[PDB]
Amino acid sequence: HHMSAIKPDMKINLRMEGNVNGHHFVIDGDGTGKPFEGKQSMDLEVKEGGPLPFAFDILTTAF
Amino acid sequence: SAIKPDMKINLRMEGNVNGHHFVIDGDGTGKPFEGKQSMDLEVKEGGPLPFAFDILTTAF
Amino acid sequence: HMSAIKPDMKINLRMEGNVNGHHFVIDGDGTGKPFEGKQSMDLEVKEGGPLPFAFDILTTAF
Amino acid sequence: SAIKPDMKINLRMEGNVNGHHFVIDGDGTGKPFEGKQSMDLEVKEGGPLPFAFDILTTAF
Amino acid sequence: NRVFAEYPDHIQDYFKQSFPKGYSWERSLTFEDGGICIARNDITMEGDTFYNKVRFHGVNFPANGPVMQKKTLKWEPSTEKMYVRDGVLTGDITMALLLEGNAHYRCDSRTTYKAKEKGVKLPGYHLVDHCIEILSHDKDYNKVKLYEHAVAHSGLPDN
Amino acid sequence: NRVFAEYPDHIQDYFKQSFPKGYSWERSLTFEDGGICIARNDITMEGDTFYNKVRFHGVNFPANGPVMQKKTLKWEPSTEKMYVRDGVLTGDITMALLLEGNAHYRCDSRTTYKAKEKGVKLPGYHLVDHCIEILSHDKDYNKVKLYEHAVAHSGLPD
Amino acid sequence: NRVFAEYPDHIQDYFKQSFPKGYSWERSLTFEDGGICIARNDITMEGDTFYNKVRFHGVNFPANGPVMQKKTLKWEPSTEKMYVRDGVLTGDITMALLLEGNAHYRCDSRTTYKAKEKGVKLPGYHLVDHCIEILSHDKDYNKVKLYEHAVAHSGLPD
Amino acid sequence: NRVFAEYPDHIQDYFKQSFPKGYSWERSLTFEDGGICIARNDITMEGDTFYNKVRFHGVNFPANGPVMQKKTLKWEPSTEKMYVRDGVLTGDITMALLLEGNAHYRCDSRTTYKAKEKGVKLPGYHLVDHCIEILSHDKDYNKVKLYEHAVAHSGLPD
Ligand SMILES: O=S([O-])[O-]
Ligand SMILES: O=S([O-])[O-]
Ligand SMILES: O=S([O-])[O-]
Numbered sequence: 092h093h094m095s096a097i098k099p100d101m102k103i104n105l106r107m108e109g110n111v112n113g114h115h116f117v118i119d120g121d122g123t124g125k126p127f128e129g130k131q132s133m134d135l136e137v138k139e140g141g142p143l144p145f146a147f148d149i150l151t152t153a154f
Numbered sequence: 155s156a157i158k159p160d161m162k163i164n165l166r167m168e169g170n171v172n173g174h175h176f177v178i179d180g181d182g183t184g185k186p187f188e189g190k191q192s193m194d195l196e197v198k199e200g201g202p203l204p205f206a207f208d209i210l211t212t213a214f
Numbered sequence: 215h216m217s218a219i220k221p222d223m224k225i226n227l228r229m230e231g232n233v234n235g236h237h238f239v240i241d242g243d244g245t246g247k248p249f250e251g252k253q254s255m256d257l258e259v260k261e262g263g264p265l266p267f268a269f270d271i272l273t274t275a276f
Numbered sequence: 277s278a279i280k281p282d283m284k285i286n287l288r289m290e291g292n293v294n295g296h297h298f299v300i301d302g303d304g305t306g307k308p309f310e311g312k313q314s315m316d317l318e319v320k321e322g323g324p325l326p327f328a329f330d331i332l333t334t335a336f
Numbered sequence: 337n338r339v340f341a342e343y344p345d346h347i348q349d350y351f352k353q354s355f356p357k358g359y360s361w362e363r364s365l366t367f368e369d370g371g372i373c374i375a376r377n378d379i380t381m382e383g384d385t386f387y388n389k390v391r392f393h394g395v396n397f398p399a400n401g402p403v404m405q406k407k408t409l410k411w412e413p414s415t416e417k418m419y420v421r422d423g424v425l426t427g428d429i430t431m432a433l434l435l436e437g438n439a440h441y442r443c444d445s446r447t448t449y450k451a452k453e454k455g456v457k458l459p460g461y462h463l464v465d466h467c468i469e470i471l472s473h474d475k476d477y478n479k480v481k482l483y484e485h486a487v488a489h490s491g492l493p494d495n
Numbered sequence: 496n497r498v499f500a501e502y503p504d505h506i507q508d509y510f511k512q513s514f515p516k517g518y519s520w521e522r523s524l525t526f527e528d529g530g531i532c533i534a535r536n537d538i539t540m541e542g543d544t545f546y547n548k549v550r551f552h553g554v555n556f557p558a559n560g561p562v563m564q565k566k567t568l569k570w571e572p573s574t575e576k577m578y579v580r581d582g583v584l585t586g587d588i589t590m591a592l593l594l595e596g597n598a599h600y601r602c603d604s605r606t607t608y609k610a611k612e613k614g615v616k617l618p619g620y621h622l623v624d625h626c627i628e629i630l631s632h633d634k635d636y637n638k639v640k641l642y643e644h645a646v647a648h649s650g651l652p653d
Numbered sequence: 654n655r656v657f658a659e660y661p662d663h664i665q666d667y668f669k670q671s672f673p674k675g676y677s678w679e680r681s682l683t684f685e686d687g688g689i690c691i692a693r694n695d696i697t698m699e700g701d702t703f704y705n706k707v708r709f710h711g712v713n714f715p716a717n718g719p720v721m722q723k724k725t726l727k728w729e730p731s732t733e734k735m736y737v738r739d740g741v742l743t744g745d746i747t748m749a750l751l752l753e754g755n756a757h758y759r760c761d762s763r764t765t766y767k768a769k770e771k772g773v774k775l776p777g778y779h780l781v782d783h784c785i786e787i788l789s790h791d792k793d794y795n796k797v798k799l800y801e802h803a804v805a806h807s808g809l810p811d
Numbered sequence: 812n813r814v815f816a817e818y819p820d821h822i823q824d825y826f827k828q829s830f831p832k833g834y835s836w837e838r839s840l841t842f843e844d845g846g847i848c849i850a851r852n853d854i855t856m857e858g859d860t861f862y863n864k865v866r867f868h869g870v871n872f873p874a875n876g877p878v879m880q881k882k883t884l885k886w887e888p889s890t891e892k893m894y895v896r897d898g899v900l901t902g903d904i905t906m907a908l909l910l911e912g913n914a915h916y917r918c919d920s921r922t923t924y925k926a927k928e929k930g931v932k933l934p935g936y937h938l939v940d941h942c943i944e945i946l947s948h949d950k951d952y953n954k955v956k957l958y959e960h961a962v963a964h965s966g967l968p969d
């Protein structure tokens with residue numbers, strides 16, 4: 092076991108690239124979280140392929 | 155050897171679908187080497203069946 | 215509304231079954247606390263013992 | 277037609293299996309009305325592949 | 337009963353080699369709407385007659401589904417894939433029932449076959465084409481005339 | 496028997512509301528190595544006793560799998576997902592049997608629950624935590640003492 | 654590419670009717686040990702040449718499994734079941750890889766096929782026999798020669 | 812990112828112990844109507860920031876299904892079952908999307924989790940409660956605010 096360097100308050104950067112039913116998309120993400128409290132939030136922006144022709148919900152567990 | 159070109163078939167199926175008990179008797183004939191068979195089926199108990207008879211057919 | 219479910223209940227049980235071609239019968243007698251979400255039961259194999267398969271597969275069916 | 281008896285096939289596959297990126301090019305020929313085709317495949321990126329090539333074959 | 341299947345000379349016929357003592361099978365039917373059936377048949381032989389002790393159990397069929405609503409027309413023709421798994425001959429089938437309104441209803445079938453006698457040689461991988469038909473029935477399906485045709489083969493290009 | 500589950504006030508308790516007339520369930524157990532079981536139970540009540548008429552059928556268990564080889568140790572604690580499908584209360588569970596060596600053997604369970612009496616109010620989506628344990632058994636499992644604890648809840652954040 | 658399939662007169666050939674404009678397919682491959690693959694192909698045509706834009710993604714293959722261990726020998730010959738679902742031609746297949754030691758490794762495949770042009774007539778239910786073969790390859794499979802033969806039919810009796 | 816889960820002292824936290832170097836996950840999502848997705852995320856850390864390189868691919872969603880018709884409302888709270896499979900930490904989830912019309916749409920998830928560095932201790936079987944929510948969005952879902960809360964536990968009795 093070692094020091095994780097994980098702070099109680101962390102920032103989150105994210106880029107998602109994907110394809111659903113032939114439809115390509117790029118989604119950028121920026122958020123914050125509390126790892127030891129098990130909580131996070133993120134602001135997501137569709138950069139390419141918007142508006143998405145499918146339910147956004149299917150992507151959410153993958154951010 | 156043991157199997158003849160023409161054979162007889164006797165069958166008894168007991169079952170339960172969706173909580174509904176049934177009994178089905180079968181009598182028929184077939185040609186094992188030609189890969190063909192036919193059977194007359196009769197619902198003894200549980201008639202009329204409240205489900206598609208088709209789901210049972212590959213099990214006779 | 216009027217369920218007639220008591221805080222302490224007895225449980226009677228009879229299981230008949232067939233796994234892998236092996237027929238079995240199991241009788242059960244136990245007690246439980248419905249409102250605490252708890253039960254216990256003594257089970258006895260009446261036919262098909264000893265079972266040639268893992269007893270664990272049966273347990274959620276009791 | 278649009279369908280000719282003897283036709284050519286050009287292909288590019290890009291993919292990722294278990295995190296391993298790859299690119300594969302194909303050049304082949306086939307006979308549509310006979311339902312036969314063959315193709316020469318070449319891994320351009322990600323060779324040698326760390327997984328069985330067979331998993332890819334129906335996707336060319 | 338896979339005894340009633342045309343086996344060519346180049347494929348081991350496990351089922352005809354299982355007699356006179358016979359064989360048994362176990363089956364699971366997994367329908368696309370969550371309906372699940374299990375079935376068993378113990379097959380014996382006396383004289384010129386095959387005897388079938390069949391059991392069939394089905395659960396979780398939706399109330400408004402094609403099965404409970406009796407909206408099925410027929411099984412489409414199918415091809416069974418026969419292979420050995422853990423010392424046992426196994427047949428997997430991608431099956432489909434035709435429904436009223438021309439839609440299909442998918443079912444995945446797995447059957448395991450076991451000869452009664454020891455030492456019956458297991459076949460190699462092969463395919464068995466199937467077609468099953470209700471030839472006739474009364475209104476309530478209390479009486480049904482059933483027919484099946486089956487042919488074993490090696491698949492393309494040897495079929 | 497899901498009457499033995501602790502239901503909080505804010506969640507409809509379909510099972511205690513099913514009595515005194517009772518309820519039935521049907522279940523499929525799909526194991527990762529192709530073994531498949533179906534089970535049924537008709538649950539009635541007479542005075543202070545529940546009566547359980549249970550049937551259990553299992554097919555296609557491999558000869559050298561953990562079931563026929565008796566390599567299982569216990570069911571791990573689980574969470575049943577309760578919801579309505581086609582007007583019927585349905586429970587789905589991701590289950591796992593602990594095996595010798597601390598490996599796991601997966602089983603997917605689906606149960607459908609049906610009250611005997613018509614017009615029993617169906618609950619909304621909820622979770623039921625489960626833990627089942629063989630407390631004791633003799634060598635060949637001819638005699639077994641079984642225990643279960645179940646608590647219904649709404650999941651996070653509560 | 655199902656354009657390379659011998660179709661008899663009594664079965665609608667969706668794939669040959671999809672050209673010159675072309676068609677696309679999407680596929681899932683579900684292996685019995687949890688490995689899952691998705692794939693797509695965009696098929697177009699110019700003169701006597703088909704062009705294929707193919708994408709292939711696979712996850713959850715275990716390190717000790719026959720795929721990552723490279724213990725496969727070939728796909729066994731198969732039969733694809735072709736049918737319409739939600740207005741789209743769909744193919745389901747019970748597939749198997751032959752492994753070293755003559756065991757088999759099962760894969761379930763579903764493909765959806767969509768013509769680019771509007772108004773291409775959907776076929777009725779039919780079967781397509783397949784066989785696929787790596788004819789030759791170098792040591793590391795950096796170079797592979799592949800072959801496929803496919804025939805559409807109505808099944809028994811004919 | 813399972814680093815955002817509250818882990819109690821008695822359960823090994825594979826995810827927090829994977830840092831500073833990080834970890835990756837692969838996932839399959841199998842929907843009840845044949846829609847299948849795969850996803851990957853490679854997670855790193857620099858200073859006070861986690862970085863996520865995510866890929867997502869989905870196929871075979873029917874045209875009139877809830878996904879292509881955008882008829883989903885939310886993921887219901889769930890419980891991930893965490894265990895070691897073929898030497899790799901794996902999470903299986905029975906998931907449900909609430910639809911318009913109060914129906915549910917089922918999805919089975921399997922995630923495999925792999926630390927980038929050697930020496931990361933593997934946990935015993937445990938459970939992780941999840942709840943995920945779109946807090947706000949614009950009309951076309953071009954902009955979305957997402958929130959998650961996760962807590963690891965040992966299940967009943969507690
Ligand atoms: O449908 S077949 O059995 O003629
Ligand atoms: O596993 S529980 O019943 O202690
Ligand atoms: O396997 S066949 O394509 O020769």
Ligand SMILES: O=S([O-])[O-]
Nearest residue numbers: 942943944958960
């Ligand atoms: O749904 S939860 O994330 O508040």
